[PDB]
Amino acid sequence: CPATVLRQWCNEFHRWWPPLRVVILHAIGESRVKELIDSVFTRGHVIITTYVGLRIYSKHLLKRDWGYAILDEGHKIRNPNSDISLTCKQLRTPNRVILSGTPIQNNLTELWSLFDFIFPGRLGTLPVFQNQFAIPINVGNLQVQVGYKCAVTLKDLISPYLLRRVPKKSEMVLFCKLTAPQHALYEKFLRSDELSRILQGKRQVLYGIDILRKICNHPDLVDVHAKRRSKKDPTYGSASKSGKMQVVKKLLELWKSQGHKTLLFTQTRQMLDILESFLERLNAKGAEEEDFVPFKFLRMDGTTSIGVRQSLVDV
């Protein structure tokens, strides 16, 4: 189980079934873990492990036989060929159960790799799994019917191996335009040597679409002095240059006076600096004048500690 539910997983054991003994894979539940191993198979009933902690004591875990196997992680297995398979699929037990309602999110290769852990391959090998129906599903008449049967065969083959069970919502998508300073920086980066250099193969496209998203968030994020002016230059953020501040200012102020607890969502902690300078400036403007209320934001990320979590989640 993840490290965010470690105590939780021991808790239901304690409350529902006290007769079941339990031992987490930590300093308690290099010799000390070996005395822990002493009578962890006869006396010990259930062993708990964080899915980072197996490769801390795997020397004396993967060796002996095991019974029932539970893994509460269906998005940290995904596709094959990773440390996942290295420390997981070497377990010695038919009983293999995964607890996750989102196993399929990227591709059917993840499906094959997840089916491998539970069953020894009722479908076939990875080359077999691919050559069977990988391309036909993607491309697809000339595809549908043969593809229809080749897919329903898979559905009947794996269906008795994974269970499936399922106010209102408004999805308004606004299509804003690139500003003129944005279009200039877009064309400048558009016609440059680095893009072709990435395309031919010396680099990866992952570093050329991260920088063209770096300009869409706002112009001032493709600067070389990003860290040098992120939190010590009160002009780094700015407004109306991003092409989205106006549909941010208007949309957030339509709820600020309306009193609607709203969620602002990003992906980068670097753009958090800009949206945080922006909202501090909004706070300054509101506080200087009257008939208003402080914006009162907060930012949470991996920089903070695991202890904080729920607290802010609650506040």
Next chain:
DNA sequence: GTGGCCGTTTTCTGTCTCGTGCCTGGTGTCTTGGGTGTAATCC
């Protein structure tokens, strides 16, 4: 509140030489004939 590592998202005329290949002058090895030689047999 310090970091470790994995996990992740996409598809230079200029001149010379060194070597050799080709042409040629020599030279081997031979073939024909021509006379010398013997045969020889008419009568």
